[PDB]
Each structure stands twice: as structure tokens, then as C-alpha cells.
Amino acid sequence: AMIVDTSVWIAYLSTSESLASRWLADRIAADSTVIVPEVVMMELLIGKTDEDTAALRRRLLQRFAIEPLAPVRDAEDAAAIHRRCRRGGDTVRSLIDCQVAAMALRIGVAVAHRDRDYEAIRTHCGLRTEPLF
Amino acid sequence: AMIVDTSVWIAYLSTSESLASRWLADRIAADSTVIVPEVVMMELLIGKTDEDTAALRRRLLQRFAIEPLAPVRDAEDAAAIHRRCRRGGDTVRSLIDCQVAAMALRIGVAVAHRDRDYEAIRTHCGLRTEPLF
């Protein structure tokens, strides 16, 4: 039961040789639970403009658990996370990363990722991560 | 009843004078209806790391209608908007803009903004805008 960040899904879709891609392929093969935040779904759905490819990726993510953000609260927490990290000297590059982290902290799961933004959030907020560089 | 994008709120909060800033000041002074998407609220709350400033700005936005996104649907539409614009030759620079547009089109309001991204969305999807450059 963990959150798989956009960065890993992108790695999975981009090559078949990276650690991140291989890791996700293994997780998919084992029928393990993948939590898909709706904001991660959103980022993934813009990677190809063809509507049939988009529809196919939509069905890919539907295999897993698509989780909606907690209205207002996740967004407030995301901004709180960004401010805390910045006070700590780290400017997180995406508010979407912070929403994902806010959700993870809320439901108590780790985030699998290939994005140093999450290690920044780990440093200042404690977020559990599985880095896959 | 209209959505005010982050870009206009930033103009207002910034120390620089500008038409956008004067426009929002006027609208605030008139008690006109301002719609605040949660993602706009999120963006605005990271502009200053100071927690007391954040809290005060949280109360600023609370004066108006904080509008929640529609779970899953707004995110899907945001991505569809981004794909449609990209097929039309415009790469929208923020998925948050797309979420704001998705909400605007769903509830049927215009977006006041100082961000060409919404003019691209207007071209391809018909989004009503009030540009404030």
C-alpha cells in the first residue's frame, strides 16, 4: 500500500531499463497495491496528446486505486509543506509534489519516487519515501 | 461571479503597481463575488514562508468563496484541456491553470488573469477570460 509518484510512472512509460521502471514493472507483476493520487493521474494523462493513448493510460491507472485529494485540507497542507521546506532552505519545484506528500502524510503511506523534491520533504517533514534513482 | 487566477492575486500582493493590482483592489472594494479555486489558494499561500503571513492570507481568501474542485473529474478535464491545447500548438505551462479552467468551464464562469496560458485555453476550449496585462 503505497503512493507511486508521477516520476516513477514516467520512468515506467519512458524506458524498460531504469531502476524505477523495473521496480514498477515488478510491483505491477506482483499485483501489489498502487495508490494513484488524482494529481498523479492528471500529470500522466498529458504525456501523449492522442486521445486513444490517453484513454488507454486512463484504463491503466484505473487498474489501481485512484484516490481523490481531501478537499481544501490537502491543498492547505501542501502549501504548509512547501513553506516549511523553503524555511529549511529547499524550494520544492512542484506544488503537485506537495499535494502528493500531503496525501501520503494524511493516510500514512510512503511515496515511491525518482524526484529529489520528495527527499527534501522527507528531510523537513519526515515523509517516508522509496527513492528509485 | 468570476474566478480570479493566482496571477492577479500576485499582482495585488506584490509591491509593484499594475492594472491587475488596481483591478482586484477595486473588485475587493466593491464587495464583488470572487471565486477562489483551492489550487489558487494553494499557490497564493506559498508566496511567503512566514506562517503568520500565510495565516493572514488564508483569512483574506476565506473572505470569498473557496470553491472545491470536483474529485477526479476536474483533474481528468484539466488533462483533456492540456492535450487539446497541445494538439492546437500551445503547451500550457501549468496544470494548475488547466484545473482552474476545468472548474470555470464546469460551473460556467470567466477567469480574470494575467497569464497568456488562459488565452491559449480560450482559443482551443472557449474559456471566457478577463485579461489584465
Partner: peptide
């Protein structure tokens, strides 16, 4: 419209099927 969720083999078949942006690009267009 959301089609039927992919089966396991179907999902695995999408590995390497392509993405127009790096993660860096998707976070800063």
C-alpha cells in the same frame, strides 16, 4: 468515458510505450 481497467499483462505491455516529457519538463514547461 472510462474504459475497462487494464489486466495485468495489458498493464505490463505499456512499459516503455512512450512519454513526451521528462519529469523535470512536466514540473516546469
Amino acid at each position: 468515458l472510462v474504459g475497462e481497467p487494464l489486466g495485468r499483462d495489458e498493464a505490463l505491455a505499456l512499459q516503455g510505450s512512450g512519454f513526451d516529457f521528462s519529469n523535470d519538463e512536466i514540473e516546469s514547461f
